[model samples]
Target: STNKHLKNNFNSLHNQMRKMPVSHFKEALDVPDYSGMRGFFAMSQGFQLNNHGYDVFIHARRESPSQGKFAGDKFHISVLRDMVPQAFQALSGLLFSEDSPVDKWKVTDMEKVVQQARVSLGAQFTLYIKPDQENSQYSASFLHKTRQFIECLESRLSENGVISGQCPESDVHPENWKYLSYRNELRQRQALREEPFYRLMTE
Candidate 1:
């Protein structure tokens, strides 16, 4: 029954996304600023009430890329349920500026502060929203809540020593590094598989 409840909630959220207005979606997250660029230009993460599933679906669908040249390359952060505390801490840690002293904070310490902050905020499942290259549609309320979530999380993180503001130059820089090895590998694998299809179709 609990699983069914979760599924129902997910479906409700998904449907809400399908019906949301496009303008409100734009206000939710700016896709144009980050679009056209070949790599990530900006990023943020946070937590929020599930709103019985509407918020989660709205956030997920809006982040889905629309048509464009680099659309396929767009990287959208998924808003998953029940994300482990350590994962949240690691991700939030990555959001801090490289020069921030927070970089040296232990993952466990980050996790503890995150957990405590979350309880006070009455939210769960650290929600991550990243704009890759495009947009879609979502409700005004959905937009408002997501915006609030980021601000709330930023304050919480800052109080805990996870500095907020511009992300570290190193992490945001567009370069092939260990952190991006998986993305590169996956892209290469896809290209390999598509090569034969391309040759056949062209012939």
Candidate 2:
């Protein structure tokens, strides 16, 4: 039983990491497929979910434990819905297998806040992992893993015709291009005014 408890503690080492400032885990994995400002994961820029008006974003980070004996951190691979007006019906076994990284997520509509803010974005899928152990390779491996996850996702998406062929970089949905850029414009203007309303509203 003691050995089992020790294993539990070891599995949840990321609990310590989660409490630390994201800067402590700060890393940049600038690639053609995605963009981000913080640690772990960022936006897969212009990444759409289907041919319709629906879209999503991917984020990776450490989180609280799930339904196990773990008290340690759980690795989160989350999805943010963009411009979708309905509940998330996908991202289950149909999107990825049970063992897939994202199968461990919860779908969030963010219906009230984003709807009121007029952003129309919802955070849907979130995948968490109970790490077996920690090592020097934590950051490096996860960074690569995020990309690997992206490539796998893109391939799957394209195969299902959710997106086009391998080059997801293509500008198939100009609306996504405009909309993604559209929000940035508001943020920029707010920055010019040094606005506090956005912060006050969110916080």
Candidate 3:
């Protein structure tokens, strides 16, 4: 399944990481006109985004066809921070610059963060491996892909796993599944009707 392949891509990266200990991500939508979940970082051209983005499984586990059924077995989800925001970017630049001297800051071990093959920071995103701190936690390592390094959270076993990526609230055993699908379908059709049309011939 495309979902399993997605997981495979990430697992491959984790295995590839030798020098770097952690990873981070940026926005999924790096390229224009392409599906963010399927392009840029995700090398999944034909992969479809269902509900939250996990195609880990072609058919969702524990869900009926009447309910939502899909997977990313993509095995995981990605994370990121804002891109244009200067505050985070400002800190990012300084961190990478070893001699960029600050008054009170320690400025230690940043060269290891940058100037190395690990130079792929968030593969260029607002997100980093360690959320609040500059130093990466021992257990937390970001997954790396060929082009970008987006957050990759692999799916775990069920009956015990109880994942939390695409599973949004409100549908937790709710009775509005039928009505919700109807409402969602209508909204999509309305939006599709409101879009622009393309020409018959190529430019």
Total clashing pairs for each candidate: 0, 2, 18
Candidate 2 lDDT over residue span 1-203, tens digit each: 22244334433433443343322112222222111111123322222222111323333322321133222222221223441211122222222332232323333334433544544222233334332334212232332343244335433333443422111221111221211111112223334222221111111
On residues 116-196, what C-alpha lDDT tens digit does candidate 1 reach at each position? Answer: 453322122222322122342322334333333333434444444432222222122122111111111113344532332
State which candidate has the highest lDDT: 2
**Model number with the top TM-score:** 2
How well does candidate 1 match the true structure in TM-score terms? 0.22
* Stretches > 4 Å off in candidate 1: 1-136, 163-203
Checking candidate 1 for backbone clashes, the offending pairs are: none
Runs with alpha carbons beyond 4 Å of true place in candidate 2: 1-90, 94-96, 102-106, 113-118, 121-132, 139-146, 161-203
TM value for model 3: 0.16
Ranking by lDDT: 2, 1, 3
